[PDB]
C-alpha cells in the first residue's frame, strides 16, 4: 500500500527557445511525483503541465500536494484500478492524474518484478521517435531540418500556423534537403478551416507528402477539423481537441480525424486506455505526444508505446530538447530508436 | 515462453434440461484449455462453445488443437498483447479465443505472483450473480423462482421469448412471490419489436420493474433493439447482437441499447476489455454473462469483473446449474456472492 506521496518542482532549461503558434517557451517547468510503498518500493511520475492546453499552472499543481496524498494513501498499488479511479477526479490537473497514475504502475510493476511496458501488454520491443522543428525563419528551420536528418531522425514533425505563406514555403524547403523522410505538419490551433485546407493543398501540389496534419484549427471546431479532414489530402490529427476518452468518442462519431495525438499529460494512463480501445475499435488511428517532459517523464510514455504498440507515430522528443545532466528514463535511447531494458 | 497448449472435451449434465427460445440443453460439452510455460507454470481457460451464437461446434474446436500450438508455441506471456492479437485470428472459434486468452494471462499472473483479476485492475473484492429461471410451465417458473429467492438470490434472471402470453403471466407471478428481488428478463431473440414493447408495458403496468430487458429482437435487427428502447421503459441490452468491439461501436453509435451484455465466450479477452473501455467512455451499461462453462470457465469472468469492476449486474451462474463434483475456480464461491482468495 501506498504510505506517501511526494510532489517536487523540477526546472529544465530548453537547449534553445521552443516556438509553436502561439507559444515560445526557454523554460519547461515540471513536477516530480514519488509513490512510496509500505515494502519501501518507491515509484516515479512526472508532471509536465499545460496552460495553453490543460488550463494548468505549475503552481496549481504543487499547492495541492497534501490533498493528493490523502487521496491515495492507504491504497494497494495492486488495486490500480481503483487509483485511476480515484486520480480520474483531478480532470483539472491531468498531467498530475498522469504522473500519480503512472508512478502506480511503476512502483507496481516493480512490485510485481517486471517492468511498466509488459504491465501493459509488451507488445512491442522497439520504438522510433521523430524530432520537432519549432517555428523560426525559413532558413533557421531548414538549418535544423537537415541537422536533424544527420542525426539518423527519419520523421521530421514541422511546426507551422503563424503565416501560412512562410510555412508553405518552409514546408517545401525543408522537404528538398530531406529526401527520405517522412513529415508530420503541426499547426497548434493556427489555420481557418480554409487556410489548414490550402496549406495542405499547396504541398501536396509541389509533390511533398505530409504524414500527419496536426490540429490545424481552434480546438472547439470539431466540423472544422472534419471539414478539413474531407477537403484536404493528408490524415488529420486532433492533439488539442482530444484530451478525454469522451474527447475521442466524439470525434470518432462525428468522423472528424484520421488520427488523435494521445498525450498522458492530457488524458493520464486511464483515458489513454480507453481511447487505444476506441482506436483499435474504429477507424481511428494513433500517434503519442509529449509536451515538456524530461527524459524521466518521457520514459512514462515510452513505456505506455512499448507496452500497447498502439502507434503508427512516437513524438516524443521534449526530453532531446531539454538540457539534462544525467539521463533518468528506464528505456535505451539510440538515437531516434528507444527500446526496452 | 509456452511450451504446451493443450485441448480437451470436459461434458458437464445439467440439473434439470435449459430451456431458452430456440434451445434445449441437458449437456454441455466444453472444451478445457491449459497452457504450460518453460518454467512449468500452468495456465487454465474454458471455451463453452455455442452453434446458437458463434455458430461454434465443438468437434470444430478441438480438430485445430495443432494450429493453435502452431500460432503461441515460443511466444513468452510477458508479451501477452502479441498472443492476443494473434489470438484475435480465431475469430471463427471465439470461445477457444477466449480460453487460450484467459489461460495467458492465468499462466502469466502466476509467474509474478498475483492473481488475473489484479492484473486488470483489482478494482473489486466481490461480487454478486444472479440465477436462472429457464423456460417452463408458470407453474414450475414460480417454483424455481421461489427457490432461487430462499436460496439467497437477490437478482434472478427470468427466460421468455416464445409466449407473450405466458410469458407475461410467468413474470407476474415470479414477482409476487419474490418481493425484494430485482429482474432480469431474457427473450433471447424471440419477440418480434412491437411484442418485444407490449411484453415491457404489460409487466410495467403491474407495477413490476425490469432491471435489464435483453436481446428481445433477432440478432441482426439492431434498429429493432433501439426501436424498444425507445418505446418501452426498462433498460434493453445486447447479448447476441454484441460479439465484438466493433459491434458495440456501431451500437452505441446508433444508440441502439442501455446496455450490452459482455461475455468472454463471444468476446474473448481482448474485445471484453475494449468494450469495457467503449462502455465507460459512453452513456452505455454493462452487465456480464455466460454460456455454459463449468466452474473452472466461470472463474474467467469471476476474475475479469474483479479485476475492471466495469459491471452493474453479474449472469455469471452456468456452473451452479450444472453436476460438477469438485469446484475448480480460482475464487470463492459464497451463496450468489463470489470473492477473490
Ligand atoms: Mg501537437
Ligand atoms: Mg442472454
Redesign the interface.
Known amino acids: 500500500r501506498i504510505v506517501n506521496v511526494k510532489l517536487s518542482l523540477k526546472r529544465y532549461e530548453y537547449e534553445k527557445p521552443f516556438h509553436i503558434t502561439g507559444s515560445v517557451s526557454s523554460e519547461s517547468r515540471n513536477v516530480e511525483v514519488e509513490i512510496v510503498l509500505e515494502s519501501g518500493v518507491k515509484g516515479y511520475g512526472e508532471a509536465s503541465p499545460s496552460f495553453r492546453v490543460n488550463g494548468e499552472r505549475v503552481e496549481a499543481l504543487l499547492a495541492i500536494e497534501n490533498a493528493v496524498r490523502e487521496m491515495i494513501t492507504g491504497i494497494?498499488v495492486?488495486?490500480?484500478?481503483?487509483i485511476?479511479?480515484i486520480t480520474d477526479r483531478l480532470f483539472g490537473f491531468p498531467s498530475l492524474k498522469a504522473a500519480v497514475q503512472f508512478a502506480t504502475l511503476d512502483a507496481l510493476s516493480q512490485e510485481?518484478?517486471?517492468q511498466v511496458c509488459?504491465?501493459?501488454?509488451?507488445?512491442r520491443d522497439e520504438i522510433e521517435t521523430d524530432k520537432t522543428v519549432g517555428i523560426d525563419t525559413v532558413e533557421n528551420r531548414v538549418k535544423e531540418a537537415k541537422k536533424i536528418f544527420e542525426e539518423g531522425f527519419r520523421v521530421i514533425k514541422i511546426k507551422v500556423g503563424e503565416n501560412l505563406k512562410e510555412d508553405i514555403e518552409a514546408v517545401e524547403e525543408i522537404a528538398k534537403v530531406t529526401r527520405g523522410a517522412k513529415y508530420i505538419v503541426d499547426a497548434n490551433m493556427g489555420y481557418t478551416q480554409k487556410e489548414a485546407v490550402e496549406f495542405a493543398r499547396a504541398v501536396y501540389q509541389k509533390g511533398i507528402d505530409i504524414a500527419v496534419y496536426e490540429q490545424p484549427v481552434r480546438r472547439e471546431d470539431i466540423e472544422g477539423l472534419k471539414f478539413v479532414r474531407f477537403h484536404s489530402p493528408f490524415p488529420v490529427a486532433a492533439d488539442e481537441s482530444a484530451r478525454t476518452?469522451?474527447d475521442?468518442?466524439r470525434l470518432?462519431?462525428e468522423e472528424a480525424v484520421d488520427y488523435v495525438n494521445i498525450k498522458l499529460m492530457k488524458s493520464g494512463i486511464s483515458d489513454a486506455?480507453?481511447i487505444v480501445?476506441?482506436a483499435?475499435?474504429?477507424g481511428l488511428k494513433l500517434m503519442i505526444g509529449c509536451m515538456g517532459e524530461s527524459s524521466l517523464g518521457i520514459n512514462q510514455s515510452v513505456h505506455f508505446a512499448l507496452?500497447?504498440?498502439a502507434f503508427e507515430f512516437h513524438d516524443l522528443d521534449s526530453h532531446l530538447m531539454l538540457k539534462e545532466e544525467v539521463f533518468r528514463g528506464k528505456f535505451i535511447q539510440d538515437g531516434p530508436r528507444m527500446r526496452v531494458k
Chains 1, 2 share one sequence.
Open positions: 494497494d495492486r488495486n490500480y484500478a481503483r485511476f479511479e510485481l518484478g517486471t509488459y504491465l501493459l501488454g509488451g507488445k476518452k469522451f475521442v468518442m470518432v462519431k486506455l480507453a480501445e476506441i483499435e475499435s474504429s507496452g500497447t504498440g
